[PDB]
Amino acid sequence: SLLPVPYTEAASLSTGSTVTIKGRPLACFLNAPYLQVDFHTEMKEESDIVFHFQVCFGRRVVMNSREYGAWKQQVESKNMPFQDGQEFELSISVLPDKYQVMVNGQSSYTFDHRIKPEAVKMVQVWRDISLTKFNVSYLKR
Amino acid sequence: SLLPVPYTEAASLSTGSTVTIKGRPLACFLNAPYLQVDFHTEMKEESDIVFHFQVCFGRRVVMNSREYGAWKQQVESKNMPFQDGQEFELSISVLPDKYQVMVNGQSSYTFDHRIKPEAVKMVQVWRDISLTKFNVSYLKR
Ligand SMILES: OC[C@H]1O[C@@H](O[C@H]2[C@H](O)[C@@H](O)[C@H](O)O[C@@H]2CO)[C@H](O)[C@@H](O)[C@H]1O
Ligand SMILES: OC[C@H]1O[C@@H](O[C@H]2[C@H](O)[C@@H](O)[C@H](O)O[C@@H]2CO)[C@H](O)[C@@H](O)[C@H]1O
DSSP states (O other): OOBOSSEEEEOOOOTTOEEEEEEEESSOGGGOOEEEEEEESSSSTTSOEEEEEEEETTTEEEEEEEETTEEOOOEEEOOOOOOTTOOEEEEEEEOSSEEEEEETTEEEEEEEOSSOGGGOOEEEEEESEEEEEEEEOOOOO | OOBOSSEEEEOOOOTTOEEEEEEEESSOGGGOOEEEEEEESSSSTTSOEEEEEEEETTTEEEEEEEETTEEOOOEEEOOOOOOTTOOEEEEEEEOSSEEEEEETTEEEEEEEOSSOGGGOOEEEEEESEEEEEEEEOOOOO
């Protein structure tokens, strides 16, 4: 739709930051579209990933980190609040101990910090979605 | 780039048809982009898939068919002629007994017919690529 995908925005994160994403899958769930949100340590796409969030719509969610080029311990979830054929609202909050992912207002995943959020310099949103809104909040000290 | 992705074209296939696709992955191989080519029995995306061709760039290729709504026997290949960061040329030939997939001029995969190619009514090309060329040939009787 309106925002380019893959979507890249230079970003900084700290405790209390919220990343808000509104979008829609590009295919019915039967065809297994993906969504991926990566919090990167540099603007280069090859850079480390502090928080990797990958939705296989209708099937599972995978979370991990890529640290000095290597993927670490995968977290796999079958929780699937996303609805077939529907627009979704995604909110990722930077809490002191973890990321908290809200989906359409509902707490849906959390992921403990493995690298401090201050290491983030870029956010990329990509795979089989269109996007109409992306925001990183910058209200807190 | 130039062609919309997901890309959909109404299509007919028979022995001797060639589907030609030129495109580029939207991410470096380290970030595991996908490419998917589906030969559908109807224009609806939910319709059966006579030939499903799914590249996880740098890792593997999966082929299958979706018949009366159900995925059948997966074929998994580690053959990976696609090159990191490069444009690719993909040619899918409809031979009497199988599809033959050429990648950059090189025979790279084949998949025996499970449903007659005459059942195809649509081709979709999607996931993490841009496309500059798509053609279905219509030269043969
Ligand atoms: O875990 C998320 C991450 O997986 C990558 O693949 C990892 C995989 O997680 C792990 O189980 C294996 O031992 O190593 C793989 C590669 O280092 C994928 O590249 C990726 O897209 C992510 O989803
Ligand atoms: O095989 C290609 C096809 O897999 C689908 O998932 C299948 C899977 O192949 C099979 O091993 C399992 O037993 O059933 C699954 C669902 O019916 C995926 O949906 C897909 O994207 C394809 O890659």
